[PDB]
Amino acid sequence: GFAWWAGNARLINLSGKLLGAHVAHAGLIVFWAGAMTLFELAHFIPEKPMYEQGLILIPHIATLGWGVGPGGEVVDTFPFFVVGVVHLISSAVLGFGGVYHAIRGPETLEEYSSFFGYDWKDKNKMTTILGFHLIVLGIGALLLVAKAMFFGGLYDTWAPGGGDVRVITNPTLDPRVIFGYLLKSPFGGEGWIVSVNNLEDVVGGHIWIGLICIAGGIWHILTTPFGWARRAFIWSGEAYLSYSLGALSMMGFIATCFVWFNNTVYPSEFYGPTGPEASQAQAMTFLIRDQKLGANVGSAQGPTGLGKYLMRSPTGEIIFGGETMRFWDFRGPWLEPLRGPNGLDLNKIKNDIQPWQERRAAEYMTHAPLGSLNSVGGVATEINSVNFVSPRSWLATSHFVLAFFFLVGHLWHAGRARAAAAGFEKGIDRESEPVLSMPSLD
Amino acid sequence: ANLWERFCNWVTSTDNRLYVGWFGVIMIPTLLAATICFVIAFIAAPPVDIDGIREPVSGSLLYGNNIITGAVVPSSNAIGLHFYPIWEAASLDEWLYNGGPYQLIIFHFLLGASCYMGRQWELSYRLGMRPWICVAYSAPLASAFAVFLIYPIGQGSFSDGMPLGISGTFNFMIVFQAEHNILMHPFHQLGVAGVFGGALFCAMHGSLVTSSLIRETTETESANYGYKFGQEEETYNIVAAHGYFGRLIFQYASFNNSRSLHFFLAAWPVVGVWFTALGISTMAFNLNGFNFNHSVIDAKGNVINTWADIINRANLGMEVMHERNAHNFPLDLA
Amino acid sequence: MEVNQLGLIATALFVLVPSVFLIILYVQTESQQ
């Protein structure tokens, strides 16, 4: 009894047409991944940093070690083409199965086959489908491990000499390290799992997750939910959707912070510098300029009494001064050579800054992730000239919006699933209004 | 008869004057902590070094503020996004100087308000209501997350979160405009349409229902006494209201279905405020309002100013003066 | 702080005089029954 604007709710109990909707939609996702990659490649100019060109998919491929060499220079565009073509081609297969199952195939699957058919309220069948998909997911996490360890490695921004593709031979297996990330505070200087800063931990985490997902998949194929879980959940397709919307919302907010703060699995070479990074790079830049002119940057007192170039963090570490004092948790391969045990090392600053560090700071300061909606780069008062919005801002903002709306959708569908399960989603029975049979509050 | 199940029955009782519920078990302590700390800080907290430059800003009444100027001041820029509970300070004196109370208040408040939203779902379920009032409240709730949590996360510091005070609020608005040109951002423009439109439709609906009240009283008594709580009959004539409003404009621009009408009332401001909350939340990552600065130039290349360049002059005056001691380098990159 | 000293009596009467008006009217409403 749904209206046209809620028309996809008419599929809740049509397993065959619903399968087609899902598979056709999957074709749309893979189609966009292929079409967008080819569009990005058609526009790609190798002499410009990726992040001056509005690219978000080529950076993901480069990060896996395809197409790039030392320093992130693009050496071969063919892997990008391949990725895009194969996705694009694959979307026709998914589109074909999708429209066949949506339009021509059995409307319900329960009759054609007891294996593919399902009842939302069949807790055994639901956990079995979940188990299969967990196994698939586990395999997917192990593919990343396979790439990193046996098929060319990954791009490592921390590699000595400017960054490079590196095979991961000793992934981190120590669960104190792997699960230690899951227990770190999400606040500053800690950063929960967003602080992962080396590829050994990245790959070992995916070994763990792959194994965990396969084990849990096997578990759910073989079990039925225990009574305590039976009594805690709503068992209906809309309820299950609502659970997944909540999970996607959570994941999207996490992805947002990943791309905004992490410069390891989102190398700044490809994505541009992070906000903290660019701010630090400004202070580095003027420290360099002023020191070259003769300034003693360690002893220069600024207007407030705090150091103009250098000051202490609240726990004593020597850090950049000015407003970037807030960003002293930043860590990046161009800056760490200057760090000693007590923070920034005055003797390294005076003696060991290299031209490539000067260049990188100047580049990152002038490519900070600030810009207008019409892609005028810089602070809001800047004049037109530079066409630039950082890929990090594009990826952060988009995924914040999506994550927010999916939380709304979680609330919408979770509340509706509860009300429909108890039988009052269409309104209050005039003849049995609960409040009319309750005592008054006063 | 079991202790836990009796506790469970009291927690979820529909007979409590104020509903508690499981969300209430978290909401009540966190709102009380935020409220008590807020009241005490507003009255008596000493000055706070908001921008981390050893330049403390007095926010409380006893230190020379009135109701309009007073604020609980954001925590120090020196802290940034670091977690600063009391037990991390060497002393309360230190915690107060560095703006500790702000953190305690906003974290307890955001948790408590979140649970307030869940509590709205929860009682609707206990009462056999439909469930989505809580979805309406997600619009103001999202807006508070934006200014107290998301914007600091994006800019790297709780010192750039919204101060808990009347003039502090205006300070936050002005700085935001200089750094993000929020007025030229479509999501804020949608917020204005949501809020202006919400006020419009509030007045419209109130005046149309009020215009069509059925005569049930005399000139010597308030017409409100013509309605009795829980009566079954509607108290106004919606067909007369529609007959007036459809002629004021034209027939098909007026609702005759009260359900669609009240759904529209709900949806317009909620959706507008979602957008404006998303505006703040995405300007948190410096995707700023439209920049048409020097977009119009003449045949020779002279800039021809538009009203956008005049906005820019105002934005510049805000930019160059804000936090006038806090910048040592030429770009205010966060 | 050097506030206007008449601000106190201004505020006090601004609160007191309207409030008393309403209390007068409420209490004589109650005693009607």
Partner: peptide, 30 residues
């Protein structure tokens, strides 16, 4: 004196909330 006045008014408002909630006129049906 101004601080006393501000906090006094605030305190009266909180007290009013108490009466308005717990000593409201009870809504009665039909």
């Amino acid at each position: 004196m101004e601080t006393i006045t501000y906090v006094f008014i605030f305190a009266c408002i909180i007290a009013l909330f108490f009466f308005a909630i717990f000593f409201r006129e009870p809504p009665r049906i039909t």
